[PDB]
Design a protein around this ligand. Structure first.
Ligand SMILES: *[C@H](C)[C@H]1/C(=C/c2[nH]c(/C=C3N=C(/C=C4\NC(=O)C(CC)=C4C)C(C)=C\3CCC(=O)O)c(CCC(=O)O)c2C)NC(=O)[C@@H]1C
Ligand SMILES: *[C@H](C)[C@H]1/C(=C/c2[nH]c(/C=C3N=C(/C=C4\NC(=O)C(CC)=C4C)C(C)=C\3CCC(=O)O)c(CCC(=O)O)c2C)NC(=O)[C@@H]1C
Ligand SMILES: *[C@H](C)[C@H]1/C(=C/c2[nH]c(/C=C3N=C(/C=C4\NC(=O)C(CC)=C4C)C(C)=C\3CCC(=O)O)c(CCC(=O)O)c2C)NC(=O)[C@@H]1C
Ligand SMILES: *[C@H](C)[C@H]1/C(=C/c2[nH]c(/C=C3N=C(/C=C4\NC(=O)C(CC)=C4C)C(C)=C\3CCC(=O)O)c(CCC(=O)O)c2C)NC(=O)[C@@H]1C
Ligand SMILES: *[C@H](C)[C@H]1/C(=C/c2[nH]c(/C=C3N=C(/C=C4\NC(=O)C(CC)=C4C)C(C)=C\3CCC(=O)O)c(CCC(=O)O)c2C)NC(=O)[C@@H]1C
Ligand SMILES: CCC1=C(C)/C(=C/C2=NC(=C\c3[nH]c(/C=C4\NC(=O)[C@H](C)[C@H]4CC)c(C)c3CCC(=O)O)/C(CCC(=O)O)=C2C)NC1=O
Ligand SMILES: CCC1=C(C)/C(=C/C2=NC(=C\c3[nH]c(/C=C4\NC(=O)[C@H](C)[C@H]4CC)c(C)c3CCC(=O)O)/C(CCC(=O)O)=C2C)NC1=O
Ligand SMILES: CCC1=C(C)/C(=C/C2=NC(=C\c3[nH]c(/C=C4\NC(=O)[C@H](C)[C@H]4CC)c(C)c3CCC(=O)O)/C(CCC(=O)O)=C2C)NC1=O
Ligand SMILES: CCC1=C(C)/C(=C/C2=NC(=C\c3[nH]c(/C=C4\NC(=O)[C@H](C)[C@H]4CC)c(C)c3CCC(=O)O)/C(CCC(=O)O)=C2C)NC1=O
Ligand SMILES: CCC1=C(C)/C(=C/C2=NC(=C\c3[nH]c(/C=C4\NC(=O)[C@H](C)[C@H]4CC)c(C)c3CCC(=O)O)/C(CCC(=O)O)=C2C)NC1=O
Lengths: 162, 240, 160, 172, 162, 162, 172, 172, 160
């Protein structure tokens, strides 16, 4: 759970010392971040369902073979589409959780830490999730510094994928 | 069988042998301990730090991962010390690091990674090499982890680190052990046969004798503008 | 040159100069302005010739890159292009003289021992000037590649 | 392990006096452009896996001897170690341009890795060319203003290319 | 050298990962700090000599025995006063260095790490330096948030002393 | 390099003892294995080029999208097909090397140890190689116990892939 | 750490092609004589303590300076270490003739033990003569028939004497 | 790590014979003066902190460049490390004059600390002068009588000054 | 060398070598092992002494660095740093030679003419070699530094 206040406490604890001005600098910076990041997370919460459906449709558009071939890993049947869009919403929910938490900790603990072996065991290409995250980071519709750090979290998920 | 004692060797002057009267700063190694009841994410950071210390960064492959040892550690069935022993006795470590080195160089590598210090002298490498020959690599690692030096510095719950690499007044410390002692030396490199120093960067006859780097000595160039006054005026100086 | 080959063929009969042979000196001078324009253009991209033509040599001869052959590392392949830079210097010496006798007295007369005693084969250097030949035509015009290419194959004929 | 500020502090302590005024105006301009330094750093950081894959992609297209059997990066394990070495070099470049000092890049890589690549039999030339191509692609990725306000990255292209050339020359 | 950017790089290096939004939060916070801290360090540089003499006079005032008794540790003679006010200026210079660096690192590396054994070997009471730092933190004459964090660094030196 | 004689020497060395009858049992077993395995490796050497082309064609047949979409990871262009069939021949050569060596050591050291991160970095699906190895283990045309242990090595490669 | 088979595999991989047919016939003959090789190994292994005790005694009958006070093998502890060094050398010889390759004997002893005996002050000449006498006694113990079917012991005498001479020359 | 007695034992074992009589009379006189050696060692030990503080007190009065900013012992941490280095040297001198042999002083300090002071940038000259001044003050503190029965301490001033000069020369 | 003068002063009066001259030759060869170990340690520390002694010139005499002075700019001070590399190389020639006549053939015997002709201040050249001795005495033990230090101080009064 790599969030700034948690890791500041971990630094001060591993050093064995009290808190210094360094952690207070970390804190006024974190409050500066959260002062826009919480409203941006609320805006993503508002636009979430349409973003999930648009990402799923873009993923079906770029990879049309997954809709066609019979296979339980592919979303040819309906249960594949339910589970599929479920993990689209999982990715978007982890993006909002990292927007609230202020660090990549929630996605690192809920998504990243086992995603490689899961995609290895289940024959899931990570490029599908890369395409979906690219569609989300194109279509989230935020502006300014909140948009840049949202794109930062999504690009972090992309780099963790491939 | 009478236990053959470890061969005696002389100690060298190292930073780790003196008391350090130091204030914690950015050059201090991050201590990963299990004593603080680590969160599920902190366990993954501790495990990652232990793999980095024992294998090196380039050996943190999915195929080298000891998933059973990690689950035993996360359940509290084994100590961090026992986890370090399990990593240093693992098949991928012995294949990559033991089989590609002599007993002397393997002893040096294990002292650097497990005790977090350099070897005092060549005689210490010889003294540990006979333990490896008599007890195997497993019994050598167990004897290293049972040393008072390991227990006094790391105990049971701390991941080993390079002790006192940087002095508090220096921006440049000692070389990291992973760069100082790579997986194999020149001797095993010659046995493997082949490297192809493929491409050039020519130039047409242009050097022979030049120490180009003035570099540091210059420069001042503060400069000044100088005024004019009469020569006759005793400025020149007249003794008596 | 023509002129120092004119006179040394006139001492062999101890006569004066033949008047029809005096026209080959007069043709040598008046056809000299376009010859030195070839030589500066080879000089103006002598590193661009060598760093290109060295690369197509090693894909043709992999013995001198895969270990076991003669010249390797930075320590001998830079000396390998030090040979090819000398031969490129000889051709632009040969173009301004008109003949191959500056290349004869300097650079081909003892070649069949100084690589024979030095371990390297001959014919890959003969493939190196051919590698230098293909990039020398491409910098020049049509007829200028015909005259300057007439000195490159002399290097192939004396070596191999 | 030095900042810009700790570098000025260590120099002022070796002088033994207080910090002069012109160094403080320089540090004020550094504090004004430190975020500016940062924008390139974050857009450099977000595309790191694409950078190292494209760098190895061009390098192994360029030198197929490494992929060839008997080559230094031929084996699957060795090729993964190759990509790991490149990613480590890029990460310490990003750290050095974060702190604004090359001393972190020196401390963490440079003094040992040249001897490491000599002892391993690793050709220093290919990894030098790979770090150069990775740095060229990194400045090329950083300099394009896609959805970013209009500013000046001049001096920071200067600094990033300095860090990459220091890494490529210390590798050799 | 515990400065915020250095320790952020140390966190990201020990974790083995790239930089995240956490370090950028640390950075906008550090720039917010330095934007007043550099001018406050310049103001302390201006008032430094009078502050040093006032601290030395307050130390002689509260502990009058040090001016009286013969002893090379005490500032009875003149060389004691030269060396004494020299280490007053040392303390003030380390305060300004930590004001520029943005963390307690410079005082921790230049003063704190050996001060206890030095005062043990040399028969120097640390309470003298505590009195001097108290006079400095009373008389520095800054205002606002720069004054509060200056007092933070001086109080950190006091707590490290005794 | 997990080969039986090597690991027997490693057992006897780590125990610190001489060789016993256990290693000689390992040896008469290994010679029993090699007595058919060497001829089976020669037969695979004979049928290798047609097996490589058939595996590549079966891989293009089951995954037709890789021939169609533009992408340097996909074998749409000709260089993708050269490199592709090159790594088909790599897989087959490692199978023959493990047939000669008598253990999974050569594939474990030349293929398996980094294949996961390589397929992660290069956007290569391992299912392509699984399909190719399935075609090879169907079409190698051996018989008997040599065929069973050849299928064992290929199935080991499949399980190491996904 | 190489077998015979892994040696052919590494050579064929460095060539980059499949294994040629003549190497496979050579390995088939190796698989036919590998048991040959190792009955030989087993009768070498069973008499190992007698071999090292007869070697040391013959050696200390030959060079009484080592037993003499001030000698290198004079002290009881040092003499036990001497017998341990000899037994280790014999064991790695048996390992190398088990795997059929000298690379295990090289890997485990040779590159370090020459420098070890220089640094210790151990005379390399006496231990070289002792390894030579131990190897002569080992082939003499291996070659005799005592209830075993006739076989082509010969060549393997070639290989065992090769391993012993490699050990004695790497000791020096 | 040797005594006087273990030194005679190792020499007699390298000779290979028993201990000769004159060495035993020498060791009997050593056993008679060993207490003489060490009461002084005790008066050397009791004033050790005063010795190192007066030694650094005279040294930093003598060479003010070390106290000057940029000097090697300028920083508070480095100055504490300086006093620690001096106290360690004095302690091993007291150990060597306890055991009556310089081999403990050699073993624990000498072979490494010269290279340590070279690598650190520590000036060996100042610490050599400091060990010399500390040794002069140590013999001056040991030699005076203030309630102790008088005795001839001529060979132990000899031995202590020998140990201090060995330390100062091995430092250089 | 030392036998080079001792032959010639015994030559020009047509004498053989008199035993007042032989004993300094016999003393020279037993001191030959010392002066070789001197002459490695200056060349072993050769890179660290050429930028250290040149930096010691540039604080005491910064006028030659200044514009209008001769060693102005990085390029001219680069050849005003080798210039110093010869005068270290010549001194370690004469140390192993025993006498100073290798420096009298190469260093000094026209140096008042050429440095007049080059315009460089010859007094500042002697200031550098005076700085070059004081850093060279720090590396060496003093009983050998007193031997080599006379060869430095030969050259100091030789320039000035
Ligand atoms: C390179 C294309 C081929 C090659 C070159 C090679 N040469 C050497 C060594 C020498 N080469 C020369 C070449 C010339 N000398 C001349 O005088 C002239 C005419 C002006 C030429 C063209 C010489 C003298 C040497 C000796 C070294 C020297 O120059 O001082 C090497 C190194 C050989 C070694 O064993 O060190 C190499 C590799 N060899 C090839 O394989 C290429 C075909
Ligand atoms: C690809 C660009 C080039 C290349 C890379 C390569 N590196 C290795 C092996 C090692 N590389 C290192 C380097 C570092 N370790 C560090 O900790 C740091 C700084 C934090 C650096 C720069 C080390 C120590 C090793 C050996 C141990 C290991 O696991 O990785 C290899 C593999 C060699 C092997 O035999 O495994 C490769 C292939 N080599 C090339 O071919 C390219 C030129
Ligand atoms: C550089 C190659 C290009 C460029 C950059 C540029 N950026 C700024 C200013 C800002 N950039 C940011 C970015 C962030 N602040 C954050 O907190 C985060 C999350 C980690 C990001 C991504 C911000 C906020 C600023 C300033 C404050 C604000 O924008 O509200 C400038 C100008 C201002 C400055 O110097 O900081 C520039 C020029 N511009 C180019 O043209 C380059 C191609
Ligand atoms: C006046 C302020 C009080 C006082 C001071 C005093 N101190 C010393 C001696 C030393 N003081 C230091 C302290 C520092 N050195 C540093 O480098 C730094 C940080 C930059 C500090 C704080 C040290 C190391 C010494 C020992 C060095 C030395 O001896 O010169 C003296 C001189 C006494 C002495 O011989 O040791 C004095 C007078 N004493 C007072 O009476 C005042 C109350
Ligand atoms: C004061 C007399 C001189 C001086 C001392 C000095 N020493 C150091 C640092 C080190 N000194 C040692 C020496 C030893 N360590 C040992 O274990 C032993 C024997 C048991 C000896 C003799 C070592 C290893 C170090 C470095 C590690 C450390 O903590 O101390 C310093 C500090 C250098 C620094 O940068 O911290 C100083 C100042 N130096 C002088 O200036 C005087 C000439
Ligand atoms: C909270 C973070 C989180 C993630 C990311 C997650 C992914 C995840 N996706 C799974 C399966 C799946 N994942 C997909 C997804 C797709 N396949 C396609 O063809 C589409 C391109 C894509 C649609 C987005 C599908 C269809 C399944 C069901 C396939 C299965 O049996 O395993 C499974 C196995 C569980 C199961 O079999 O039902 C996991 C664990 N789980 C998590 O807890
Ligand atoms: C000896 C063991 C060994 C293996 C297995 C190996 C695989 C391997 N395949 C690679 C690329 C590749 N792998 C493929 C393969 C395919 N893509 C497809 O579309 C097809 C389905 C499949 C054909 C079999 C292709 C086309 C490339 C080139 C793509 C690239 O730039 O990275 C690369 C990166 C090198 C490069 O970029 O050229 C490696 C290391 N290397 C090895 O040394
Ligand atoms: C696995 C490979 C391996 C080898 C080869 C090896 C050799 C080795 N022999 C040693 C000592 C020794 N080796 C010898 C052997 C001899 N000296 C003689 O006088 C004779 C010439 C010869 C008897 C053949 C002796 C006497 C010592 C003891 C030296 C001592 O204890 O001081 C030591 C010093 C540490 C110790 O024994 O306890 C090593 C490391 N160690 C290893 O781990
Ligand atoms: C680990 C327990 C074990 C042992 C000991 C063993 C030995 C052994 N030696 C054999 C053969 C043999 N062994 C020898 C050995 C020799 N003949 C000579 O004349 C030479 C002097 C000498 C070698 C120096 C020969 C010649 C054969 C013939 C059959 C063969 O090639 O294996 C065979 C073949 C099968 C059999 O005999 O039933 C066995 C079993 N097998 C085992 O499982
Ligand atoms: C461990 C506790 C302990 C101490 C400290 C100790 C010291 C000690 N020093 C003694 C004698 C002595 N100690 C000295 C020492 C010296 N005289 C000089 O003038 C020199 C300057 C100096 C040596 C440098 C002398 C001369 C004697 C005379 C008696 C004798 O030879 O022991 C004796 C003889 C018995 C006695 O005095 O009652 C004692 C007890 N005995 C102990 O049990």
């Amino acid at each position: 759970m790599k969030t700034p206040l948690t890791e500041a406490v971990s630094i001060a604890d591993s050093q064995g010392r009290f808190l210094s001005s360094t952690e207070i600098q970390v804190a006024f910076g974190r409050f500066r971040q959260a002062k826009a990041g919480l409203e941006a997370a609320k805006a993503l919460t508002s636009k979430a369902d349409s973003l999930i459906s648009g990402a799923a449709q873009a993923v079906y558009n770029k990879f049309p073979y997954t809709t066609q071939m019979q296979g339980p890993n592919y979303a040819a049947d309906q249960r594949g589409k339910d589970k599929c869009a479920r993990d689209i919403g999982y990715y978007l929910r982890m993006v909002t959780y990292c927007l609230i938490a202020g660090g990549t900790g929630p996605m690192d603990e809920y998504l990243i830490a086992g995603i490689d072996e899961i995609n290895r065991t289940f024959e899931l290409s990570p490029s599908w999730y890369i395409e979906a995250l690219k569609y989300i980071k194109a279509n989230h519709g935020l502006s300014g510094d909140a948009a840049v750090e949202a794109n930062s979290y999504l690009d972090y998920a992309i780099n963790a994928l491939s | 069988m009478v236990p053959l004692p470890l061969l005696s060797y002389t100690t060298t002057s190292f930073n780790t042998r003196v008391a350090g009267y130091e204030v914690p700063g950015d050059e201090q190694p991050q201590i990963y301990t299990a004593e603080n009841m680590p969160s599920g994410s902190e366990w993954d950071t501790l495990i990652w730090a232990a793999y980095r210390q024992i294998f090196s960064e380039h050996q943190m492959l999915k195929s080298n991962r000891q998933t059973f040892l990690e689950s035993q550690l996360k359940f509290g069935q084994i100590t961090v010390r026992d986890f370090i022993g399990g990593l240093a006795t693992s098949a991928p470590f012995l294949e990559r690091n033991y089989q590609t080195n002599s007993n002397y160089r393997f002893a040096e590598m294990c002292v650097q990674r497990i005790l977090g210090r350099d070897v005092y002298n060549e005689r210490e490498k010889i003294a540990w090499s006979i333990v490896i020959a008599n007890k195997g690599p497993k019994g050598f690692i167990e004897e290293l982890l049972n040393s008072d030096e390991y227990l006094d510095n790391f105990g049971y719950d701390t991941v080993p680190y390079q002790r006192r690499r940087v002095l508090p007044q220096r921006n440049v410390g000692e070389t990291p052990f992973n760069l100082k002692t790579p997986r194999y030396n020149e001797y095993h490199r010659t046995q493997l046969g082949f490297p192809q120093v493929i491409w050039q960067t020519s130039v047409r006859r242009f050097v022979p004798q030049e120490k180009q780097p003035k570099a540091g000595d210059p420069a001042n160039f503060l400069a000044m503008a100088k005024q004019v006054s009469r020569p006759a005026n005793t400025v020149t100086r007249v003794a008596l | 040159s023509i002129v120092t080959k004119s006179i040394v063929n006139a001492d062999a009969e101890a006569r004066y100069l033949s008047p029809g042979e005096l026209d080959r000196i007069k043709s040598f001078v008046t056809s000299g302005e376009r010859r030195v324009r070839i030589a500066e253009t080879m000089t103006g991209a002598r590193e661009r010739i060598i760093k290109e033509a060295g690369n197509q040599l090693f894909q043709k001869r992999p013995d001198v890159v895969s270990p076991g052959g003669n010249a390797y590392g930075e320590e001998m392949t830079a000396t390998c292009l030090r040979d090819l830079d000398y031969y490129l210097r000889l051709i632009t010496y040969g173009i301004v003289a008109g003949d191959v006798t500056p290349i004869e007295e300097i650079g081909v007369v003892g070649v069949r021992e100084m690589y024979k005693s030095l371990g390297t084969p001959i014919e890959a250097v003969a493939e190196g000037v051919r590698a230098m030949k293909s990039v020398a035509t491409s910098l020049l015009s049509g007829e200028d590649a015909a005259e300057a290419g007439a000195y490159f194959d002399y290097l192939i004929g004396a070596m191999s | 392990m030095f900042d810009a500020f700790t570098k000025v502090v260590s120099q002022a302590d070796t002088r033994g006096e207080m910090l002069s005024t012109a160094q403080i105006d320089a540090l004020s301009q550094m504090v004004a452009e430190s975020n500016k330094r940062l924008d390139s750093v974050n857009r450099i950081t977000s595309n790191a896996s694409t950078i190292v894959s494209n760098a190895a992609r061009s390098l192994f297209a360029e030198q197929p001897q490494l992929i060839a059997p008997g080559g230094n990066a031929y084996t699957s394990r060795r090729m993964a170690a190759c990509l790991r070495d490149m990613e480590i070099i890029l990460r310490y470049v990003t750290y050095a341009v974060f702190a604004g000092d090359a001393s972190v890049l020196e401390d963490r890589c440079l003094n040992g890795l040249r001897e490491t690549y000599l002892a391993l039999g690793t050709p220093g030339s290919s990894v030098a060319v790979g770090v150069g191509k990775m740095k060229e692609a990194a400045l090329a990725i950083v300099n394009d203003p896609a959805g970013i306000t209009p500013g000046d990255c001049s001096a920071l292209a200067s600094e990033i290319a300095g860090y990459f050339d220091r890494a490529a020359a210390a590798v050799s």
